[PDB]
Amino acid sequence: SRAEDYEVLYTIGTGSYGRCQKIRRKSDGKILVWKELDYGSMTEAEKQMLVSEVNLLRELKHPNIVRYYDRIIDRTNTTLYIVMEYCEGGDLASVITKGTKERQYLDEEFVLRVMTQLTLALKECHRRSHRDLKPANVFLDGKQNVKLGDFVGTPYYMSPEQMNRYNEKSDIWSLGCLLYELCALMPPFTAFSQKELAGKIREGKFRRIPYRYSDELNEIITRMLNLKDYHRPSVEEILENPLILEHHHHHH
Ligand SMILES: CCc1nc(Nc2ccc(S(N)(=O)=O)cc2)nc2nc[nH]c12
Ligand SMILES: [Cl-]
Numbered sequence: 001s002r003a004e005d006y007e008v009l010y011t012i013g014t015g016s017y018g019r020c021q022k023i024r025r026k027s028d029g030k031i032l033v034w035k036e037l038d039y040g041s042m043t044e045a046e047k048q049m050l051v052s053e054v055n056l057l058r059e060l061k062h063p064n065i066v067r068y069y070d071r072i073i074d075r076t077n078t079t080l081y082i083v084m085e086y087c088e089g090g091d092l093a094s095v096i097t098k099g100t101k102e103r104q105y106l107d108e109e110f111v112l113r114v115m116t117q118l119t120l121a122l123k124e125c126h127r128r129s130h131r132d133l134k135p136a137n138v139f140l141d142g143k144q145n146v147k148l149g150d151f152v153g154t155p156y157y158m159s160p161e162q163m164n165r166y167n168e169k170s171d172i173w174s175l176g177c178l179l180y181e182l183c184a185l186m187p188p189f190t191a192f193s194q195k196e197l198a199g200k201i202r203e204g205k206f207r208r209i210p211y212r213y214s215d216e217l218n219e220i221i222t223r224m225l226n227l228k229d230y231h232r233p234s235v236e237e238i239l240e241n242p243l244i245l246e247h248h249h250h251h252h
């Protein structure tokens with residue numbers, strides 16, 4: 001509940017909200033992270049908004065969602081610390097980077113693990129009712145478990161619905177693009193312009209994922225990338241696919 005209860009080990013990274021630091025809890029030595037934000041220049045209404053936000057976030061307990069632990073306030077440094085579980089495997093964007101640089105395609109078993117566990121995380125989030133579902137916000141623990149994490153760049157994953165005129169099947173489309181990039185080490189739609197990217201997305205054409213991946217996996221990813229949302233599989237229909245087995249799920 002107090003900053004002195006933890007010791008900063010080191011800065012993991014910055015960007016987006018604020019600064020992300022790997023920390024250790026003094027009482028038991030548990031390894032966590034915290035995101036330090038600066039609320040001082042936010043309105044009272046803005047801090048109220050974010051308070052209800054992180055309350056809803058504290059109302060989320062799922063093995064495939066980054067676990068929230070605590071919140072700490074420091075009026076001296078006008079800093080709000082949000083304490084969360086540390087995922088030692090890193091993010092998925094780094095895994096895709098490593099595969100691209102090493103010219104090493106990822107195992108199909110790993111793609112199935114990500115598909116299964118991210119589908120379960122999305123199911124949970126749909127039960128508790130424009131996103132940022134992308135490799136940089138998906139993390140891995142030490143036991144192959146996948147955890148869902150919380151402008152100049154091109155929106156490579158933006159559905160045609162969210163581009164013409166958002167629903168759960170849009171989440172399915174974003175998952176499809178993420179799994180595609182895991183298999184092919186590149187997004188399904190490439191462009192230097194945002195207009196060209198919009199055109200390519202609307203036409204809905206892409207290369208098959210590399211041939212080392214099963215026809216069943218390509219089939220389900222292609223179904224997720226259908227132009228019509230009502231043709232994309234629901235969470236339930238994804239989980240019914242014969243590709244998805246027990247060992248693809250989380251394990252403590
Ligand atoms: C930065 C956001 C974040 N990161 C991590 N872990 C982690 C990240 C990168 C690497 S890396 N590129 O050195 O291999 C290793 C571990 N856990 C987290 N939990 C909540 N937000 C987390
Ligand atoms: Cl690592």
Ligand SMILES: [Cl-]
Pocket residue numbers: 100103104105
């Ligand atoms: Cl390659």
Ligand SMILES: [Cl-]
Pocket residue numbers: 207208209210211
């Ligand atoms: Cl190919």
